[PDB]
Amino acid sequence: GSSGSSGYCICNQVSYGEMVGCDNQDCPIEWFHYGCVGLTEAPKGKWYCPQCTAAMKRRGSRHKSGPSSG
Ligand SMILES: [Zn+2]
Ligand SMILES: [Zn+2]
Secondary structure (H helix, E strand, O other), rough: OOOOOOOOOOOOOOOOEEEEOOOOOOOOOEEEEEEOOOOOOOOOOOOOHHHHHHHHHHHHOOHHHHHHHH
């Protein structure tokens, strides 16, 4: 059993250093490192973690989620 860190960022590490809270409160992390996501500096506009933008993108165009059979 590995205990100690709260595992937040995608790297499964504690929430330290300059972190950017995902705009989507629903986000399971809502906290990613700047070096992990690549943010030399705070985002002027709205910033969405790579975990959401990936999901939202699929839901957008080609929104076809039917029954899995075959
Ligand atoms: Zn990280
Ligand atoms: Zn997110």
